[PDB]
Design a protein around this nucleic acid. Structure first.
Lengths: 59, 176, 209, 142, 38
RNA sequence: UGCUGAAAGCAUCUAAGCACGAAACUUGCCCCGAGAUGAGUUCUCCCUGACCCUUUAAGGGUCCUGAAGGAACGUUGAAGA
RNA sequence: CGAUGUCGGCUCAUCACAUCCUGGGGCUGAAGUAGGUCCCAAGGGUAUGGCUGUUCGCCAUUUAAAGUGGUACGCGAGCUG
RNA sequence: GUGAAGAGGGAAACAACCCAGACCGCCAGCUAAGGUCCCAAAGUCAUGGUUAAGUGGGAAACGAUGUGGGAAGGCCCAGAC
């Protein structure tokens, strides 16, 4: 159910859950675990700036 | 490719009319002789014709070759037209007209009793011969074949309609 | 194109100069009263409420009484709403006589069949009984084998078995007109018609013709 | 204590209206089914939807990948005398022009009562005559 | 006329032209040579 | 079964533009059909009391008052176990 | 094997066609009337007597037809036995 | 070798094939074989080739201006198709 809430936001940003989680695992202490992942519904301007931070560690 | 790139050349005593769509040709045969396309363009320079696709479409010179095929016979259709070819042979088989309605004797309880489409009418100079009064290669081909479907030649008799585009034949008897 | 209602008075044989006696049914068609004409095309369709007879005022309730009040003081039972398509009829309430059939050759009649109750498979579907000669016991008025042995697991719906017969709507599809005289309320037809007092005998021109 | 919980009384819906005219059915079905379930918004459980109310007005003017219009049969088994009867796509879209869009999104939606609750948020016409103007539906081009 | 997926040319009168999606064969006087597909 | 004809200087029953092509099919005749919870269309009848409670936009009482309609009662049946 | 009624016929047909008839389309080494043959439509339809318990068999007579193939070599809380 | 005496994951159900071995738990994470269009969790991934067939998801013969992939030649601007 936390995977659904994260994947919905990733899809509304043009990124896939597999890439989003892998980028946040390639950066150190950025994954923050799904038990705190309310940032997938709190604010989308900040989520877009989290997707771009994950893209800066993914590739 | 080559047939869509042919100039056609308009003959003498002929008039051409066009308004961005539907090309019309006039001469000493027919009435209002014209042809339609919805994605192909047809245009006239001063004696030569050009065919091609509209802006935002491409035919590969295929449909331009199909439009050329019709307009290149329409210039003949309005100047000398087409020859006599349709005949019928056999005992009790006769061709006639009343008004513009055909009276076609083929051993039927109905003598076809038909008047054809528009810009096309029948005439019979002799009981053996059918003349088509028209300027369109397509309708004269279709009505000549609409009639060909009635009393198709019987295998050992070979009697009925003759039409010059094929040879009508009789089957060899045993013979007893 | 529409129809009429009228009451049966009997059946007889007219006799004809072809030797055949020609069995005929006699119907008295009093002009159909017309309770409402709907030429105004409300909800996209036109209609006429042709109406014949009335129900005793001790068995007419107010929901029905106000549905006949705008064309007369008598009310109840057969209102008969027919639809109108590809034909113009006079816009104001005016009764229709049996002269509606004075230029018609063929008709059909619809009504209600006699009560035949319980029936059973044999009297409902006119079905072949089992022979009681050379044995067979305890059942002879049954159809036999209601499904195809073991692999069905089930019976199919609406099959020719069981049910009750009569007391339902029925059509006779073709009758010949013989005589029409609207000054005498007369309709004379070649043939016979289904049912007695439960039958309303809705008569229509042939729509095939 | 639970981070978040899905509640069907808390889910609020407003009215929308879409175009079907000349639209490719393979794209119309995926976006319409996701819209009807809310699977273009934030998600949680599959046992509660987050959709909205949707009108289709011109439901048979769509375009399809069906290239041979005398194929398909649409059979439905009722059990009456073991029978079934066929209809082509060209005859089906003539009898039931309002039904093609519903059976197209049926492949994107769950079965039974949970599916029927979403099929009550979708309304269909083909006469292209608007009736719910007092609800003020929101107009969508894509 | 035999229902087949392959054709035989056995007389020189035959034109052997592709006609509506397949190769075909026919002869002016003899029905034995008419073949719907190859 | 064919007409006109392109992909393809030539050719073709096919691609585009077309006319024919069956008892059937689709329309058509008839009976049934809103559990079509998608509950449709239209007409017709009738009710004009007052106060109160709740974590009161929905439920629950008191006292007054009882339309349209229904059932019960009943003489019979070309309606019926 | 701590339970699997048998042969034909009747009785009920059912579901198909590698089509029996009917509809439609082509041939014959088919003059017509005949005899022989390829195959689209599964939409409408597809035998009785004699001898026998008989599938099989021979034998009398029809129909536009009596053909091919499946169903516990099709029907027993079905009939005949 | 798999089971019998080994649970679990894939193969639609599925001791025989594939994987891996079952003490308990987790306000904790990764992997095997196999998955990731809508259902039902995750790539409607990125890129080099192939395809109009439902091959994918029974099966030989055979032909072609359906298309993709090669090599060697003939006919030819002292002029070819």
């Amino acid at each position: 159910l936390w995977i659904a809430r994260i994947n919905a936001a990733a899809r509304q940003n043009g990124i896939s859950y597999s890439k989003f989680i892998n980028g946040l695992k390639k950066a150190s202490v950025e994954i923050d675990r799904k038990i705190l992942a309310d940032i997938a519904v709190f604010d989308k301007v900040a989520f877009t700036a989290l997707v771009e931070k994950a893209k800066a560690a993914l590739a | 490719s080559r047939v869509a790139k042919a100039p056609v050349v308009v003959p003498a005593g002929v008039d051409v009319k066009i308004n961005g769509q539907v090309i019309t040709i006039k001469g000493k045969n027919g009435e209002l002789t014209r042809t339609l396309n919805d994605a192909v363009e047809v245009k006239h320079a001063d004696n030569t014709l050009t065919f091609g696709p509209r802006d935002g479409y491409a035919d590969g010179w295929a449909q331009a070759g199909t439009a050329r095929a019709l307009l290149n016979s329409m210039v003949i259709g309005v100047t000398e037209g087409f020859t006599k070819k349709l005949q019928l042979v056999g005992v009790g088989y006769r061709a006639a007209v009343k008004g513009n309605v055909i009276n076609l004797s083929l051993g039927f309880s109905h003598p076809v009793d038909h008047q054809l489409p528009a810009g096309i009418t029948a005439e019979c100079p002799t009981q053996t011969e059918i003349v088509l009064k028209g300027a369109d290669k397509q309708v004269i081909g279709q009505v000549a074949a609409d009639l060909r479907a009635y009393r198709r030649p019987e295998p050992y008799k070979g009697k009925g309609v003759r039409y010059a585009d094929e040879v009508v034949r009789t089957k060899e008897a045993k013979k007893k | 194109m529409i129809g009429l209602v009228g009451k049966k008075v009997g059946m007889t044989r007219i006799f004809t100069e072809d030797g055949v006696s020609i069995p005929v049914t006699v119907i008295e068609v009093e002009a159909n009263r017309v309770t409402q004409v709907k030429d105004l095309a409300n909800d996209g369709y036109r209609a006429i409420q042709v109406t014949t007879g009335a129900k005793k005022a001790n068995r007419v309730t107010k929901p029905e009484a106000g549905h006949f009040a705008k064309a007369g003081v008598e009310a109840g039972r057969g209102l008969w709403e027919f639809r109108l398509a590809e034909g113009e009829e006079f816009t104001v309430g005016q009764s229709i006589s049996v002269e509606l059939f004075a230029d018609v050759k063929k008709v059909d009649v619809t009504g209600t069949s006699k009560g035949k109750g319980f029936a059973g498979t044999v009297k409902r579907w006119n079905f072949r009984t089992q022979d009681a000669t050379h044995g067979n016991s305890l059942s002879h008025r049954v159809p036999g084998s209601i499904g195809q042995n073991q692999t069905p697991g089930k019976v199919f719906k609406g099959k020719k078995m069981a049910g009750q017969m009569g007391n339902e709507r029925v059509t006779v599809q073709s009758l010949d007109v013989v005589r029409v005289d609207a000054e005498r309320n007369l309709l004379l037809v070649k043939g016979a018609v289904p049912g007695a007092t439960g039958s309303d005998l809705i008569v229509k021109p042939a729509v095939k013709a | 204590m639970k981070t978040f919980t899905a509640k069907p009384e808390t889910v609020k819906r407003d009215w929308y209206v879409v175009d079907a005219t000349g639209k490719t059915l393979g794209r119309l079905a995926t976006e319409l089914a996701r819209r009807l379930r809310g699977k273009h918004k934030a998600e949680y459980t599959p046992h509660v939807d987050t959709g909205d109310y949707i009108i289709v007005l011109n439901a048979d003017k769509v375009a399809v990948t069906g290239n041979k219009r005398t194929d398909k049969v649409y059979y439905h088994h009722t059990g009456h005398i073991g029978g079934i009867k066929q209809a082509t796509f060209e005859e089906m879209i003539a009898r039931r022009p309002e039904r093609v869009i519903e059976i197209a999104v049926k492949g994107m939606l769950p079965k039974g009562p949970l599916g029927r609750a979403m099929f009550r948020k979708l309304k269909v016409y083909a006469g292209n005559e608007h009736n719910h103007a007092a609800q003020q539906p929101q107009v969508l081009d894509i | 006329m035999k229902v087949r997926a392959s054709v035989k040319k056995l007389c020189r009168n035959c034109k052997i032209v592709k006609r509506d999606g397949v190769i075909r064969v026919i002869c002016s006087a003899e029905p034995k040579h008419k073949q719907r597909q190859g």
